[PDB]
Amino acid sequence: NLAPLPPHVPEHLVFDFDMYNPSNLSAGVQEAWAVLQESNVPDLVWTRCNGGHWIATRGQLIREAYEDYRHFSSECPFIPREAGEAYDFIPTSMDPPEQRQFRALANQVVGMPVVDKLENRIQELACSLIESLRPQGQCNFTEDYAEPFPIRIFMLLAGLPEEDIPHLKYLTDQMTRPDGSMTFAEAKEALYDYLIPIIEQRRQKPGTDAISIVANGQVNGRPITSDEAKRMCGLLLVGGLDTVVNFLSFSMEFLAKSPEHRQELIERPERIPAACEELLRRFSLVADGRILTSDYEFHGVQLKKGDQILLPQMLSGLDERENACPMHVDFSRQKVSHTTFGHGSHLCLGQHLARREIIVTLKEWLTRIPDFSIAPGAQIQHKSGIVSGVQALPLVWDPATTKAVHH
Numbered sequence: 001n002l003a004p005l006p007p008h009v010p011e012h013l014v015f016d017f018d019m020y021n022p023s024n025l026s027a028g029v030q031e032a033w034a035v036l037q038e039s040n041v042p043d044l045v046w047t048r049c050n051g052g053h054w055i056a057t058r059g060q061l062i063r064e065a066y067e068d069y070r071h072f073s074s075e076c077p078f079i080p081r082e083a084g085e086a087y088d089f090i091p092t093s094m095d096p097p098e099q100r101q102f103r104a105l106a107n108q109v110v111g112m113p114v115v116d117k118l119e120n121r122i123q124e125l126a127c128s129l130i131e132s133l134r135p136q137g138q139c140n141f142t143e144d145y146a147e148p149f150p151i152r153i154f155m156l157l158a159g160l161p162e163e164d165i166p167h168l169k170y171l172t173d174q175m176t177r178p179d180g181s182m183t184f185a186e187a188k189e190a191l192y193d194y195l196i197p198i199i200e201q202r203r204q205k206p207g208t209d210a211i212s213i214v215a216n217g218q219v220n221g222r223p224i225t226s227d228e229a230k231r232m233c234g235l236l237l238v239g240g241l242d243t244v245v246n247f248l249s250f251s252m253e254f255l256a257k258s259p260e261h262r263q264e265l266i267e268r269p270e271r272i273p274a275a276c277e278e279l280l281r282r283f284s285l286v287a288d289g290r291i292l293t294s295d296y297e298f299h300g301v302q303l304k305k306g307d308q309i310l311l312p313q314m315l316s317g318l319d320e321r322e323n324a325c326p327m328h329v330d331f332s333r334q335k336v337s338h339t340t341f342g343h344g345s346h347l348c349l350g351q352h353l354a355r356r357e358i359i360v361t362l363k364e365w366l367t368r369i370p371d372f373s374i375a376p377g378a379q380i381q382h383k384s385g386i387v388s389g390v391q392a393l394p395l396v397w398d399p400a401t402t403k404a405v406h407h
């Protein structure tokens, strides 16, 4: 339930929002979070849920905090406190200047140069999976394409066997949307338990895979340690198994419900890149934060050292003060403003990979299965957390309105 209100918190700023189970969940997860942006709600509130923490509700506040790493540290970035304290991935748990040197190494394994070179494999996997579903006239998108498409692409890049997916997928999910069976510390340790032996073997006999590159990597001229490699690989694992996987579902759910918007992409293919950005704004899904390094007055609100503050990446683009008709999806929107990949020194390094996976999915799906919809009488349930997602997305279509395209 609720944590007792801290001495310095003003009662008029209390809004008991629960990030792991928002009250307006059934209306759609983004909609649930948007309640924090209704006219009467202040720019900075305090919730007594999940141990108690502040919550910036507007893009201006969210962008500011992420830029100011001196007052807002990434050292304890998760809600609840025990999870944030136990979180030590690299570079996500570091603040500049220390974290800077580690980004370059991560770029070597997931940056644009590597992505460009994966294009053919990404398109090939997308086409086989899709053509595999096309004649069926149905599927549950989360298990049939959303999880397998991005996860296998990553498992390949990392040199990790596909049979290890169910175990790793379960562990990463306990870190973002815990079902209660595991604490954040335990899931993290089980992940390190999986990676440790592998990093040791990759340093003994290195291959060309992502993990061999990081384990035998160098940061600012010095060699990376075994502990630092483990901390970087864990972050990469969560990225391949719990980011794009959830995003693809929100996107396909929307496309399933808007024969209009998909028709726009079928008729005008060149706007798919632009559509991707708009969908990334409308269906933003990440929400982590920072911890106060000292007593600080921020926009008239007294914050005390150690207070945690959620800065939902998903909220910036949904803010009416950033985009005029927020809940409306407009592919032709002139200034698609958002912070879906973060803001400040920690801007997502996997975004280039993310965009190619989204863009290839939209093009290869619409090209083969242009007509489709939500299964008869099904009500789509969303799930909330550090990374929001979709519980199940069953789709249906008439096979006769599809077409097999050779890749």
Ligand code: HEM
Pocket (backbone or CB within 6 Å): 074, 077, 090, 091, 092, 093, 099, 103, 106, 110, 154, 235, 236, 239, 240, 243, 244, 247, 285, 286, 288, 289, 313, 340, 341, 342, 343, 345, 346, 347, 348, 349, 350, 351, 353, 354
């Ligand atoms: C739709 C997909 C994705 C979204 C929305 C997303 C979002 C984010 C966000 C919000 C951050 C910064 C968090 C913070 O400031 O604390 C971030 C960091 C990061 N992301 Fe992603 N990401 C996505 C996909 C991926 C993928 C696929 C990979 C890699 C396989 C990846 C690798 C990274 C890395 C390395 C960082 C750390 C950067 C740093 O801390 O300096 N991400 N991502």
Ligand SMILES: CN1CCC[C@H]1c1cccnc1
Pocket (backbone or CB within 6 Å): 176, 235, 236, 238, 239, 240, 242, 243, 286, 288, 348, 350, 386, 387
């Ligand atoms: C799931 N995480 C929570 C905060 C950042 C996010 C993440 C992890 C790995 C790659 N990109 C984003």
